[PDB]
Design a protein around this ligand. Structure first.
Ligand SMILES: CN(C)c1ccc(C(=C2C=CC(=[N+](C)C)C=C2)c2ccccc2)cc1
Lengths: 186, 186
């Protein structure tokens, strides 16, 4: 809880002032904790931040569990999952803190460890989509892991770089992509 | 030089550190110049940046033409472009900086119009490839602009978010993508 209170406050601080601007000092004081306790729990602001990210990852996964029920078939889950990825990121408060962070630890190969266990978790969502797709003859992929890393990165690119259009066009392009992609698997 | 030495240091810092990460102070101090050195041509920092992007875009689009000749069919031109995208030293090594600049200059509509031509030179390569593929009957695509953007963005994704894993693994994926994509247009 004192740990949970720190992550909560830290998350808000980041959302409000971004990664670089937030200090562990602010965090310590606002969560009514101590430099010692924050050290014992996270060691560094970077670690603190990766922990928020993990928690955030969990929530996303959980939501997806409830949300994927609106998609009977896996072809549908693929369509749905990509759209959510697009819309939900449009209004995600942490997005900017993430970007600061990511484009700040691109050089540090130390963070590359947890940073990757995290990304892998996101790819599993797709991995599951495709596997189940196989066991239902929705398509036939023999290199799932591969197709999974590809979708995850192709879709995130559309989400991250399309930024330059009206939300409708984007959902449109994204659905066109999902269409093409799922097609080239038959 | 100087007007071309600034650009040199700037590009270097933008790539290495990041957009916000580097400021008009560092650029000058590291280029053996003065603050006044910027006014007529390089007014604002965002102008100096939008500059470097134009250069790099041209340098990459040029390298591409001096190399697409190794591809007879457009089907091959598609695959190639994507692979080269992973190996170049032009434009793509700045995506991270670009992503920030778009999260700190998306409001000021002074940019959304300023570097609007930049978004076209980026999707142009695929425009030609996809259009010329129609004439050559390699495929039948009606919504070219869509596909060009979908592809341009998906690809930038595979390139930007795999920057840490084995270059061969990268090129392998990029190829399975190109494979999957084009096959979905038929
Ligand atoms: C709020 N939200 C749903 C999300 C928020 C972020 C991501 C991301 C990402 C991109 C490629 C990945 N792969 C395929 C390794 C993993 C994560 C990501 C986006 C920008 C900068 C760094 C990572 C995905 C979903």
């Amino acid at each position: 809880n004192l740990k949970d209170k720190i992550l909560g406050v830290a998350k808000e601080l980041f959302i409000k002032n971004g990664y670089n601007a937030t200090t562990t000092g602010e965090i310590v004081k606002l969560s009514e904790s101590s430099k010692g306790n924050l050290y014992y729990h996270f060691k560094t602001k970077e670690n603190l931040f990766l922990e928020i990210l993990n928690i955030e990852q969990s929530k996303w996964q959980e939501q997806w569990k409830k949300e994927q029920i609106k998609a009977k078939t896996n072809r549908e889950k693929f369509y749905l999952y990509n759209e959510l990825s697009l819309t939900t990121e449009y209004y995600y408060p942490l997005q900017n803190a993430i970007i600061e962070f990511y484009t700040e630890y691109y050089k540090t190969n130390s963070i590359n460890e947890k940073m990757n266990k995290l990304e892998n978790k996101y790819i599993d969502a797709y991995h599951v989509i495709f596997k189940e797709g196989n066991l239902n003859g929705e398509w036939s992929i023999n290199d799932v892991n591969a197709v999974s890393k590809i979708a995850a990165n192709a879709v995130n690119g559309i989400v991250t770089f399309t930024h330059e259009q009206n939300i409708n066009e984007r959902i449109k392009l994204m659905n066109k992509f999902s269409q093409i992609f799922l097609n080239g698997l038959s």
